[PDB]
C-alpha cells in the first residue's frame, strides 16, 4: 500500500492500532493514522466513482445520536455506514433535555453501548461527549460538539487540500503550503481544528478578519508551538490582514467561513462584514492559478454563485469527500480483523 | 419472454431508456415505460404473495426527503427500497423553512446527490422539486408536490384498474372503460393526474361533484386533447352529474376522493352499479365510504394502497437497476 | 436442543409460534418460554463470541413508537438489524398527530401490507388491540398503558433464570425468593413479571410505603397461579415497609426515601443475591452499587437485545437454528 506513491502504508499494522479507537479530537489521529485515513479515503473515492462494490464493512450495526440538527453531517455518516454495507439506528430531532429524560449520560451510553458496535454522537455540550466516551463499552466518533471538536470535518478538509497539494505531507523545508482563513476566525471552529492539524506540516497562515472576529491567541500559540517543533516557524509563518486584496495573494488555499447574522450587534455590522469578505470572480483574479477554494458549507453570501463556475472552486468536491473520509475512518476503526486481500484497493 | 396480457415487453430496451430517469410528472412515463412498470409491478406482486426472494435491487443507497408529513407514502417508499434489498437514509418531520435553514435548494441537492444513488422527495412547494431535479446529479422520484404531481399514486391507481380491466391497454374502439370520479374534483389532484393518464386510452369519464368543487376546465381540455389523439373523443366521453344514482350507472370504476353527506358511498348507493364495478380511494377516507363497503367484494381501496408497494418497487428497479441481462429481471 | 435438563423441539415450537402476535406475557406458554430462553442464550453466546448473528435476513419490519421510549425503540431496532433484517421507523410522533383523524383500523390494514411485521408502542391500551384485529401481520407490543410489556417481562425472566436456572424446574424443594421494591402500585413491570414468576415455585416480598403497594388484582393472580402448581402457602406472599426485613433470604432484588439501595443496605442479603432494575434509575440505586458484583441491572438491559432477537427469530422465521 502506497500514498503519493512515496509513503509505504502497512494498513494491517495501522488497523491493529486503530481497532476500536474512539475519535473525539483531531489530536487522537497521529501521522501514521492520518496516512492510513488518506490512502483508504482515496480507495473509496476511486471505487465509488467507478460504480464498484463498496461493501468493505458489512456485519456491523451503529447507533447515530444527533442531539442538535446537523442534517448534512448526519446524512454523510448514514451514507458512509450504509455504502460500507452496515446498518444504523438513528436518534435525531431530539436535544440533551428531551433525549436524557432525566436519566444520566453515563447510564444512557452504558446501555446503548450494549446494543451496537459503535456510536456516532453529535451534541452541542462538550461535557456530554467526554462522559459518553468514559461510559461507553464501544468506540465513539464525535460528529461535532460545542468545544469546536469535529475531527471528520478537519480530516475531510485535509484530504481535499492534500488532493491538490500532496507535498503538504512531505515536511519539506522547500515545499511550503500557504493558506488564507477568511471571515469569522473567532467562531469558525472548523478553522481552529484544521489550523491545529495543518500546523503539524510546513504551512504559512493568512488570518483574514475584522478585529472583533480574529483568530484566538489560543490557536495561534498552538500553531506556533507545532511549527517550531518541526523547525518551520518564522516571522512570516502567521500574517494578519483585514481585507481580501492583501489576504488572498500567494496562498494555495482559500478557506471561507460562515459569517452568521446572530454574531453581530445589529444587521448594520453584519452587512458591513458580509459583502466586505464576499468572494467574487473579481476578488479571485489576483490569486495563484493553482488556488483552491474550500468552505465547510452551508455558504450563504460568503461565496457568490458565479464562483461555483470558477475551476478554483472545490467546496462541493470537499462536501462530497466527507463520504470517502467517513467510510475510511469507519472501516479502519470497526473492521473486525485484517488480511491484506480484504483492504479497499482500486 | 416478457408479456403483459398479450403485449411483448423488451424490458432490456425499456430499462436502457429509463436508467437514471427522474420521475416528477405522470407525463415523464410513455406507453413502453407504462407497460414495463405494469409487467414489473405484477412480478413483485406475485413474488411477495408467494413469500419468494424480493431482492432485485441490492447495493443501492437512497435518501428519502419528506418536507411535509405524508407518513403512509413515506413508509410505502421505505418498504419498497428495503424489500428490493437496498438501504435508505431518512429526512422527515422537517418543513421547507426548517430544513433549508436559509441555504439554497440548489446547494442542498448538489451536496446530498453526492452521498446517494437516488432521492425520494416530497415537498408542498412545486418550485423546490424542479430546482432539486436541475441541481441533483442523481435521479429524483417525486413522492408528491403542491402542483398535484404524484406520479407513483397515478401509476398505482392505473395498475389497480388494469388488474380488473386489462382491456384498458388495448385502445380497442369496442372495449371502452367508464370511470366515475366522486367528491372534491377541484382540490383532489389525484383525479387530475389519473385523468391525464387514463385519457391516453379508450376511457369515458363521469365527474360527480358539488358545485364549487367540480373538475377544472384545465383537466377537461387535457382529457379531450388526449382522447382526440387516439380518436376516442365523443360528446359522450365526458359527462357531469351532481348525484350518485346518475353518477354511478354503467361505470367500471368508482374513484372516491377526500371531499373536505351527499357524496357518501353506502351498500345502498352501490346496488344500482354494474356487477364488475371496483371502488378505488387514494386514502385516507373519513366518511366518503362507510365501513359497511369495506366488506363489499367491489371494494378494492386497501388492495390499491397495497399495490403502491409493488409499483414503487417496480419503478425503483426500472430506474436504478445497474443491469445488462434479461435473465436478471423478475420473471416469476 | 437442551437447557442442560429439558429437551426442546424448536421445529415444533416455531410451527406454533410462526406469525404469532405478542401483546401480553400470557400469550407465551411454557414450551414457548423455553424456546425463547434457549434461543435467547444462543444469541447471547453468538454475539459475545463476535460470530455471525444474521439468522433472520430477508424481513422488513415497521417500528411504530407513538411515545418517547427511545431505549426500547433502539433495543428493538438493534435486534432487527443484528438479525440482518431491515426496519422502517415511525417515531417522535404521538397518537393525535400520527392518526391525523384517520382510524387505527385503516392505518394498520394499510401499513401491514407494506412489511412482514410491526413493533408498536402506544400509551393507549385500546390502540394496540385495534392494531392486532386490523393487521394482516404479527404485532409485538413494545409497551402500552395497560402495563402490557411482554419483552420487558421476558428479559427480566431470562436475567433471573441465568443466575437461578432451577426456577424452571417447578421443584417443591427449589424455591426462588424475590423482593419487589418501590412503587408496586404504578410499576407495571412488577405486575407483568409477578404474573410470569407466579407460574413457578416463587415466594414474593412486596416492599413499599403502603399508599404504593401491589394491587389486590395482582396478588389474586399470583395466588391462582401458585395454587395451580401446588406452590401456595401462608409464606408465598409477604408485605414489608422496610428493606432490612424486605431483603432477607431473597435471591432477587427488583428495584423500581427509605427504599434507596446502598452497599450498606446489601450487607445482610444472601451472597447469591442479584439486583434487577428495568431502568432508568434516579436515586433508588446509588452509583456505588453499580460496582457491587450482585448488581446486574446493566446485564439485564443488555439481555433485552438477545431476548428481542430470539422472539423476532421464533415468530418471523421460515425454516439451521442458532447454535453454540
Ligand atoms: N441544514 C441543511 C440541511 C440540508 C442538507 C442535507 C443533507 C446534505 C446536504 C444538505
Ligand atoms: N397520519 C396518518 C398515518 C397513518 C398511516 C401510517 C402509515 C401507513 C398508513 C397509514
Ligand atoms: N431514558 C433515556 C433513554 C436513553 C437511552 C437510549 C437508548 C438506549 C438506552 C438508553
Ligand atoms: Na433506517
Residue numbers in the entry:
A (entry chain B): 38 to 383
B (entry chain C): 38 to 297, 312 to 383
C (entry chain A): 39 to 294, 312 to 374, 379 to 383
Q: Which lines from the publication concern this structure?
A:
Initially, we performed a 140-fragment structure-based screening experiment using a subset of an in-house multicomponent reaction (MCR)-compatible library and the availability of high-resolution crystals. As the smaller fragments used in our search will typically bind with lower affinities, resulting in weak electron density, pan dataset density analysis (PanDDa)15,16 was used to analyze the results of this fragment screening experiment. Fragments A, B, C, and D bind in a buried hydrophobic cavity formed by the α3 helix, α4 helix, and β1–3 sheets of the adjacent subunit. Enzymatic assays indicated an IC50 for these compounds of 10, 125, 150, and 145 μM, respectively.
Aspartate transcarbamoylase (ATC) catalyzes the second step of de novo pyrimidine synthesis, combining l-aspartate (l-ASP) and carbamoyl phosphate (CP) to form carbamoyl-aspartate (CP-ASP) and phosphate. Aspartate transcarbamoylase (ATC) has been suggested to be a promising target for antimalarial drug development. In depth structural analysis of the ATC catalytic cycle has been performed previously, which indicated that ATC exists in a low substrate affinity “T” state and a high substrate affinity “R” state. Here, we describe a series of small-molecule inhibitors of P. falciparum ATC with low nanomolar binding affinities that selectively bind to a previously unreported allosteric pocket, thereby inhibiting ATC activation.
